[PDB]
């Protein structure tokens, strides 16, 4: 995983991925979000899924939340309060141990960052007014700092892997939705059906009519749907209204 001061960003589109398997697992120590409950994650459909991944120190996992301050929350990553997503953080003690020092983060910056900004730079920040360039000196400071992720550290010092998921509420035509449930089929019974949006009531029978390879459901007159093919089997069926009198 990439370091926090250069957070890894990825875009996911045109897929249907179940979100239940995430919070149903046990490895994910922290599964935090308020914009949507875990139950209705798969129920809703979203657009422009973005994933941000990095590795940080444990004791500051709280700092990744809408509207918080701190070195990581101001100079390495920014989280707007109007955030529509979720956060998944889990321990990686046995995956990032020795200690190891190849990690870096931003320590000094002019000011805060705009939401989802990527803060990449390398300058000798000066704690005074004298201009120093080329080499560090008095009141000249190095912008970055490393992490001592020793394998024998306690809680709060072990490295934690953090993934933040963001999205938009279908501001464009739908791209990524949740999984859709399916059931079996019955015949010669008065049943109400919901075939991929087309809802109705009646009795289902087998048919000998022939469709072209691209239609989905036929009819006869006066908006009376009569024949529908099941998407799973591509087999044409017949609808007949249930008896009354």
């Amino acid at each position, epitope marked *: 995983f990439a370091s926090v001061y250069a957070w890894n960003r990825k875009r996911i589109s045109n897929c249907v991925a179940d979100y239940s398997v995430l919070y149903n697992s046990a490895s994910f120590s922290t599964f935090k979000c308020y914009g949507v409950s875990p139950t209705k994650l798969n129920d809703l459909c979203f657009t422009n899924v973005y994933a941000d991944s990095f590795v940080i120190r444990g004791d500051e996992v709280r700092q990744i939340a809408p509207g918080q301050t701190g070195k990581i929350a101001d100079y390495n990553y920014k989280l707007p309060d109007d955030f529509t997503g979720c956060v998944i953080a889990w321990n990686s003690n046995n995956l990032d141990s020795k200690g190891n020092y190849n990690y870096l983060y931003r320590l000094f910056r002019k000011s805060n960052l705009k939401p989802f900004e990527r803060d990449i730079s390398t300058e000798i920040y000066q704690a005074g007014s004298t201009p120093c360039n080329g080499v560090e000196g008095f009141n000249c400071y190095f912008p970055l*700092q490393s992490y001592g992720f020793q394998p024998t550290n306690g809680v709060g010092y072990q490295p934690y892997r953090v993934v933040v998921l963001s999205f938009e509420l279908l501001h464009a035509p739908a791209t990524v939705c949740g999984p859709k449930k399916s059931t079996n089929l019955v015949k010669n019974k008065c049943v109400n059906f919901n075939f991929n949006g087309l809802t109705g009531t009646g009795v289902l029978t087998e048919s000998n009519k022939k469709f072209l390879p691209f239609q989905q459901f036929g009819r006869d007159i006066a908006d009376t749907t009569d024949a529908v093919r099941d998407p799973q089997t591509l087999e044409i069926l017949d609808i007949t209204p249930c008896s009354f009198g």
Partner: antibody
Amino acid sequence: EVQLEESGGGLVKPGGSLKLSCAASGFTFSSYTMSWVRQSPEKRLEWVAEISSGGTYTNYPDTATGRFTISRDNAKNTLYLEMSSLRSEDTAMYYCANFGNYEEIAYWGQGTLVTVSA
Amino acid sequence: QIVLTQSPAIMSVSLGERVTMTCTASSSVSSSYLHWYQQKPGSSPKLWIYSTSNLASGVPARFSGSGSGTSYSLTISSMEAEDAATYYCHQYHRSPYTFGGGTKLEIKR
């Protein structure tokens, strides 16, 4: 809590071995890494050796590579520490404290005078 | 490992004024790993300034200081009677954990 009470010390012989037991109770010992530090009379503090309660891991400085042993027991909550063939230069006073654990490092031990005699 | 060196050995500084103390090291240790204890005579040390900027419990917001890199500075506001104590620099980045050289803070009449 009772602040990491340590086993009592006393005068020993240059060639024996004294055991320090930092048994305590008051907070979880399955995730808190212990540590042992010593101070000679009017001399800089020096970290002796720590143990990791997460996996009961042993690692400690190279000033004395093979003469320090630590055993942890979360059952009765005891921290056993000894050295092999102590010399007359090893007289000091020892603390058992909390290193590596949660950020708010605190709860230094009451101390115990581990002195040698001739 | 990196040894912690204190530039002043002892401060025979009178009451009232405001001075600074320095912790020097051969290389940069961390932005926030170091800390300072206070070993009272015949007692156990207690930490006040942690993370190189933050303050622990019991600090009257009098003890302060800032720095980064190979040298760090700790500042005061005004000396009083309870400042006659001991200070110790610390480092936790590298595997061998060391302590500061120590300063025997004392007041002068």
